[PDB]
Amino acid sequence: RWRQQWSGPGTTKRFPETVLARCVKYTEIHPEMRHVDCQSVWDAFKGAFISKHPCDITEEDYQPLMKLGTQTVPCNKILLWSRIKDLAHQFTQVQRDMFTLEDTLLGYLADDLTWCGEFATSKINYQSCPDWRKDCSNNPVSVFWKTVSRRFAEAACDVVHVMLDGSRSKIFDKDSTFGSVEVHNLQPEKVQTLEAWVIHGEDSRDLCQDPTIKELESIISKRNIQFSCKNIYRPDK
Amino acid sequence: RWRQQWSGPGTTKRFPETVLARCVKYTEIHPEMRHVDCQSVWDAFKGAFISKHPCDITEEDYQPLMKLGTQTVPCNKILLWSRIKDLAHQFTQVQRDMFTLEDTLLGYLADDLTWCGEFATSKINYQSCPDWRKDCSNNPVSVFWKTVSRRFAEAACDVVHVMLDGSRSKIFDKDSTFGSVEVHNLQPEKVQTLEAWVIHGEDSRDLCQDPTIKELESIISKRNIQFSCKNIYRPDK
Ligand SMILES: COCCO[C@H]1CC[C@H](Nc2cc(=O)n(C)c3ccc(-c4c[n+]([C@@H]5O[C@H](COP(=O)(O)OP(=O)(O)OC[C@H]6O[C@@H](n7cnc8c(N)ncnc87)[C@H](O)[C@@H]6O)[C@@H](O)[C@H]5O)cs4)cc23)CC1
Ligand SMILES: COCCO[C@H]1CC[C@H](Nc2cc(=O)n(C)c3ccc(-c4c[n+]([C@@H]5O[C@H](COP(=O)(O)OP(=O)(O)OC[C@H]6O[C@@H](n7cnc8c(N)ncnc87)[C@H](O)[C@@H]6O)[C@@H](O)[C@H]5O)cs4)cc23)CC1
Q: In terms of CA atoms, which chain B residue is nearest residue A120?
A: B120
| Interchain pair B119, A56: CB under 8 A | yes
The radius of gyration of chain B from alpha carbons, rounded to an integer in Å, stands at 19
A135 touches chain B (CB under 8 A): yes
Do B137 and B88 belong to one domain? no
Measured between beta carbons, the chain A residues lying within 8 angstroms of B59 are 1
Do B143 and B53 belong to one domain? yes
Do B32 and B135 belong to one domain? yes
Q: Whose CA is nearest to atom 13 of ligand 1?
A: A142
Q: What are the start-end ranges of the H helices in B30-83?
A: 38-49, 63-68
Are B114 and B11 in contact by the 8 Å Cβ rule? The answer is: yes
Coil/strand/helix, residue A197: strand
Are A57 and A143 in contact by the 8 Å Cβ rule? The answer is: yes
**DSSP-assigned beta bridge partners for residue A193:** A159, A226
Do A58 and A114 belong to one domain? yes
Coil/strand/helix, residue B82: strand
Q: In total, how many domains does chain B have?
A: 2
Cα-flanking dihedrals φ and ψ of residue B199, to 5°?
-85, 125
- For ligand 1, residues with CB inside 6 Å are A 80-83, 85, 100-101, 132, 141-142, 145-146, 149, 152, 176-178, 180-182
* CA dist., res. B81 & res. B87, Å (int): 9
Structure obtained using? X-ray
Q: In terms of CA atoms, which chain A residue is nearest residue B130?
A: A136
Q: Measured between CA atoms, how close is A35 to chain B, in angstroms?
A: 31
Do A67 and A133 belong to one domain? yes
Which has the closest alpha carbon to A99: A164, A161, A37?
Answer: A161
| Interchain pair A119, B60: CB under 8 A | no
Q: In terms of CA atoms, which chain B residue is nearest residue A2?
A: B58
Q: Which residues of B119-133 are buried (b: 16+ CB within 10 A; e: fewer)?
A: beeeebbbebbbbbe
**DSSP-assigned beta bridge partners for residue A196:** A162, A229
Which has the closest alpha carbon to A38: A30, A29, A26, A49?
Answer: A26
Coil/strand/helix, residue A165: strand
* CA dist., res. A168 & res. A196, Å (int): 15
Are A29 and A96 in contact by the 8 Å Cβ rule? The answer is: no
Ligand 2 in contact with B181 (CB < 6 A)? yes
* CA dist., res. A224 & res. A201, Å (int): 31
Check residue A181 and report its DSSP letter.
Answer: I
The angle that helices B15-29 and B38-49 make with each other, rounded to 10 degrees, is: 140
B7 exposure class (CB count in 10 Å sphere: 0-12, 13-18, 19+): middle
Q: Which of residues B112, B127, B155 is at a domain's end? A: B155
Q: Which of residues A155, A173, A197 is at a domain's end? A: A155
Do B113 and B221 belong to one domain? no
* CA dist., res. A69 & res. A152, Å (int): 12
Do B108 and B180 belong to one domain? no
Listed in sequence order, the residues at least 6 apart from A45 whose beta carbon sits closer than 8 Å to its beta carbon are A19, A65, A109
A192 exposure class (CB count in 10 Å sphere: 0-12, 13-18, 19+): middle
For β-strands A128-129 and A8-9, DSSP reports them as antiparallel
B184 exposure class (CB count in 10 Å sphere: 0-12, 13-18, 19+): middle
Are B7 and B134 in contact by the 8 Å Cβ rule? The answer is: yes
Element (H, E) at B196: strand B191-199
| Interchain pair A56, B53: CB under 8 A | yes
Do B110 and B221 belong to one domain? no
A176 exposure class (CB count in 10 Å sphere: 0-12, 13-18, 19+): middle
* CA dist., res. A3 & res. B53, Å (int): 10
How open is the CA angle A84-A87-A88, to the nearest 5 degrees? 75
Are A48 and A142 in contact by the 8 Å Cβ rule? The answer is: no
Q: Domain of A234? A: 73-99+156-237
Strands (DSSP E) found in chain A: 8-9, 79-82, 128-129, 158-165, 191-199, 226-232
Q: Whose CA is nearest to atom 38 of ligand 1?
A: A83
Cα-flanking dihedrals φ and ψ of residue B9, to 5°?
-60, 150
The radius of gyration of chain A from alpha carbons, rounded to an integer in Å, stands at 19
Coil/strand/helix, residue B152: helix
A60 touches chain B (CB under 8 A): yes
> Which residue of the set A23, A55, A75, A229 is catalytic?
A75
Q: Which of residues B155, B170, B198 is at a domain's end? A: B155
Residue A174 CA to ligand 2 center (angstroms) comes to 27
Q: Ligand 1 atom closest to Cα of A114? A: 16
DSSP line for A159-215? EEEEEEETTSS-SS-TTSHIIIIIGGG--TTTEEEEEEEEE-----S-GGGSHHHHH
Q: What are the start-end ranges of the H helices in B50-139?
A: 63-68, 85-95, 105-110
* CA dist., res. B19 & res. B107, Å (int): 11
* CA dist., res. A128 & res. A234, Å (int): 41
Do A111 and A216 belong to one domain? no
Do B2 and B112 belong to one domain? yes
Do B161 and B175 belong to one domain? yes
Do B43 and B93 belong to one domain? no
Cα-flanking dihedrals φ and ψ of residue A177, to 5°?
-55, -45
Cα-flanking dihedrals φ and ψ of residue A194, to 5°?
-100, 120
User: Looking at the annotation, which residues of B are catalytic?
Assistant: 75, 157
